[PDB]
Enzyme design. Structure first.
Site, PDB file in Angstrom:
ATOM      1  N   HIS A  41      37.414  48.914  -7.711  1.00 57.30           N
ATOM      2  CA  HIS A  41      37.479  49.902  -6.636  1.00 57.30           C
ATOM      3  C   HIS A  41      37.286  51.336  -7.131  1.00 57.30           C
ATOM      4  CE1 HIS A  41      41.991  49.955  -7.527  1.00 57.30           C
ATOM      5  NE2 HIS A  41      41.718  51.246  -7.463  1.00 57.30           N
ATOM      6  N   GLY A 143      46.914  57.184  -9.501  1.00 50.79           N
ATOM      7  CA  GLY A 143      46.221  57.350 -10.757  1.00 50.79           C
ATOM      8  C   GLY A 143      46.567  56.310 -11.786  1.00 50.79           C
ATOM      9  N   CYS A 145      46.161  53.025 -11.450  1.00 49.65           N
ATOM     10  CA  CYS A 145      45.247  51.890 -11.431  1.00 49.65           C
ATOM     11  C   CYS A 145      44.547  51.750 -12.772  1.00 49.65           C
ATOM     12  CB  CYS A 145      44.179  52.052 -10.341  1.00 49.65           C
ATOM     13  SG  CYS A 145      44.766  52.300  -8.667  1.00 49.65           S
TER      14      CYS A 145
HETATM   15  C1  LIG Z   1      44.492  54.008  -8.111  1.00 53.36           C
HETATM   16  C2  LIG Z   1      43.707  55.023  -7.251  1.00 53.36           C
HETATM   17  C3  LIG Z   1      42.450  55.603  -7.822  1.00 53.36           C
HETATM   18  O1  LIG Z   1      41.484  54.927  -8.081  1.00 53.36           O
HETATM   19  O2  LIG Z   1      42.525  56.933  -7.992  1.00 53.36           O
HETATM   20  C4  LIG Z   1      43.831  57.577  -8.035  1.00 53.36           C
HETATM   21  C5  LIG Z   1      45.999  53.871  -7.896  1.00 53.36           C
HETATM   22  O3  LIG Z   1      46.691  53.923  -8.902  1.00 53.36           O
HETATM   23  N1  LIG Z   1      46.605  53.611  -6.662  1.00 53.36           N
HETATM   24  C6  LIG Z   1      48.049  53.438  -6.657  1.00 53.36           C
HETATM   25  C7  LIG Z   1      48.598  52.412  -7.429  1.00 53.36           C
HETATM   26  N2  LIG Z   1      49.909  52.146  -7.516  1.00 53.36           N
HETATM   27  C8  LIG Z   1      50.735  52.930  -6.816  1.00 53.36           C
HETATM   28  C9  LIG Z   1      50.279  53.960  -6.021  1.00 53.36           C
HETATM   29 CL1  LIG Z   1      51.419  54.911  -5.135  1.00 53.36          CL
HETATM   30  C10 LIG Z   1      48.923  54.232  -5.932  1.00 53.36           C
HETATM   31  C11 LIG Z   1      45.897  53.499  -5.381  1.00 53.36           C
HETATM   32  C12 LIG Z   1      45.710  54.647  -4.593  1.00 53.36           C
HETATM   33  C13 LIG Z   1      45.053  54.587  -3.375  1.00 53.36           C
HETATM   34  C14 LIG Z   1      44.571  53.371  -2.910  1.00 53.36           C
HETATM   35  C15 LIG Z   1      44.741  52.211  -3.673  1.00 53.36           C
HETATM   36  C16 LIG Z   1      44.234  50.903  -3.181  1.00 53.36           C
HETATM   37  C17 LIG Z   1      44.149  50.619  -1.815  1.00 53.36           C
HETATM   38  C18 LIG Z   1      43.684  49.385  -1.372  1.00 53.36           C
HETATM   39  C19 LIG Z   1      43.294  48.409  -2.276  1.00 53.36           C
HETATM   40  C20 LIG Z   1      43.382  48.690  -3.632  1.00 53.36           C
HETATM   41 CL2  LIG Z   1      42.914  47.501  -4.815  1.00 53.36          CL
HETATM   42  C21 LIG Z   1      43.840  49.912  -4.087  1.00 53.36           C
HETATM   43  C22 LIG Z   1      45.413  52.281  -4.909  1.00 53.36           C
END
Ligand SMILES: *[C@@H](CC(=O)OC)C(=O)N(c1cncc(Cl)c1)c1cccc(-c2cccc(Cl)c2)c1
Ligand SMILES: *[C@@H](CC(=O)OC)C(=O)N(c1cncc(Cl)c1)c1cccc(-c2cccc(Cl)c2)c1
Lengths: 306, 306
Positions: A41, A143, A145
């Site tokens: 993604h 961030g 991910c």
């Molecule tokens: C990754 C977001 C990115 O690519 O840029 C910041 C990320 O770490 N996300 C995340 C993970 N764990 C906790 C939190 Cl609070 C945020 C994330 C941010 C926004 C969207 C998504 C997401 C939404 C739908 C499907 C998937 Cl696989 C990811 C993750």
């Protein structure tokens, strides 16, 4: 003595973490030999992550659309491909810090260490269990991910988890390093939710043995129980069933403490029916289920890794 | 979201750990530049550790009596000296993996990461607090002496703890890296014991703010209290006093959650007087005191280290 939620030393993984940027999206990647692994993604924008066609999105990309930074050094991407829910970015430099490694998929109930990372830079390390419902109760902000989970066996890093997303209850979902999700989750924005969990019974028993090894004995008793009789109680309290293989796996801890496995089950039965009456076990007022029998033996015996 | 007992990434410290052997005693040392630091009781035998005269014991030693192994490479000792309760072994090779570092002494109530080691090989990493009584509730077996505690600030490792011994209640005592013990303990075998501890009030309040940030709010209320009135309650429950500096330090967390510090004190007051009535906070059924306000801000905001 003592008993802590202990992670593996993270150095071998720190040397693999990189920053992956595509467009305005930045996340973490895992650099092993001449490949960088990251969540697919990364190629999605805000509106993409709604209902994406990843094959369509990726054919529109070029190598130069992926900026990879290893510290303050930029890695030139020379190829790219999708593998399930991960991207494999071929770079022109093999990571000189590549440890011996494997890609393993773990079972619910097993534990691993997480190296939480932001912008390719490690922030902290902690121990996680894969829940029966295939989520993990992590600590992750935006961030994170691409941060990975792993175990270390002597000198070899077994990677088992790549972080992808947070679910609405604040728990976390991700994939193995082949890009296959743990549990019924998808890398698109839907109303997906965790759904029901259970307590990992064999791990609670392991932790009760850790307590006895460390001098907590107040919960022991003279009673015993049968396996079937214990499993009737476990079902009532949302514990998962105990098997004869679980009993066998608890054999060494039983032999070290002299407490028969079925005797410890009777103690767990009493703790479930009466609570803890204001006392604690290993500094907890709840029954802890995120230590495996292996974790207890490792910590209460002292195995290192080189 | 989520909240875990999170340690610093350990790689920078892993590259400093070595094995120190003198006679039949083997423990861990810390190799920075061309000096290896280790507990001075490495020069003691079984009967020595009774009532030792370390100055006498050390003058009887030669450089060649100290075998230092960094992995599978032997380091030649070219000088030795005592500094309080640590030995400084001069070796003929500067550690090429020496990070930027400092030797700091921490305060009771502050936290740090421990890299538990055996035979110079890292085994696991976990987070510890220095208790008000200057012990730590670690996880250490025989051979762990010389393992160190540390914090990391950007790229610089602040070493704050070297492990020496386990006390009779299963808690741990050690020194700063200048060799000065934390608390009223000595590196000889006496009947020394921990003596009375208290709960770190400012940290409990920090952790209640972490809970609110993470969506646990059931313990909040409309009441407030005065600082003096709260401190009357803290004394009754063996909590240490809260100061205006503590209130000031909690300012940012207060401003982020919108919950006045004295309002959170009223909530803590109620939790102390009523217990938790079968509920949990951040997955705990006890009030947690081993997270500082800095730890909460770091984890619930996301600072990395490079
Ligand atoms: C990754 C977001 C990115 O690519 O840029 C910041 C990320 O770490 N996300 C995340 C993970 N764990 C906790 C939190 Cl609070 C945020 C994330 C941010 C926004 C969207 C998504 C997401 C939404 C739908 C499907 C998937 Cl696989 C990811 C993750
Ligand atoms: C170090 C012992 C050593 O030099 O060779 C093994 C060690 O790690 N010790 C230890 C530490 N923490 C927990 C446990 Cl269970 C053991 C240790 C073993 C034996 C004696 C002592 C000791 C006794 C009196 C004073 C001091 Cl400073 C140390 C520590």
């Amino acid at each position: 003595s003592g008993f802590r939620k202990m992670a593996f030393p993270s150095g071998k993984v720190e040397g693999c973490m990189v920053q992956v940027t595509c467009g305005t999206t930045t996340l973490n990647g895992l650099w092993l030999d001449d490949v960088v692994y990251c969540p697919r993604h990364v190629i999605c924008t805000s509106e993409d992550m709604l209902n994406p066609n990843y094959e369509d999105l990726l054919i529109r990309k070029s190598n130069h659309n992926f900026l990879v930074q290893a510290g303050n050094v930029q890695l030139r991407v020379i190829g790219h491909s999708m593998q399930n829910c991960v991207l494999k970015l071929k770079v022109d430099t093999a990571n000189p810090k590549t440890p011996k490694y494997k890609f393993v998929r773990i079972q619910p109930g097993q534990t691993f260490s997480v190296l939480a990372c932001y912008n390719g830079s490690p922030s902290g390390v902690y121990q996680c269990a894969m829940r029966p419902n295939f989520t993990i109760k992590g600590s992750f902000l935006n961030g994170s991910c691409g941060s990975v989970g792993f175990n270390i066996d002597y000198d070899c890093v077994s990677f088992c988890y790549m972080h992808h997303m947070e679910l609405p209850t604040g728990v976390h979902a991700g994939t193995d390093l082949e890009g296959n999700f743990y549990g019924p989750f998808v890398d698109r924005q839907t109303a997906q939710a965790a759904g029901t969990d259970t307590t990992i019974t064999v791990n609670v028993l392991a932790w009760l043995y850790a307590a006895v090894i460390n001098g907590d004995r107040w919960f022991l008793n003279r009673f015993t129980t049968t396996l079937n009789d214990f499993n009737l109680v476990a079902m009532k309290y949302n514990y998962e069933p105990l098997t004869q293989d679980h009993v066998d796996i608890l054999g060494p801890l039983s032999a070290q403490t002299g407490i028969a496995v079925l005797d410890m089950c009777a103690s767990l039965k009493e703790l479930l029916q009466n609570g803890m009456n204001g006392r604690t076990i290993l500094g907890s007022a709840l029954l802890e289920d995120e230590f495996t029998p292996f974790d207890v033996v490792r910590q209460c015996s002292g195995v290192t890794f080189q």
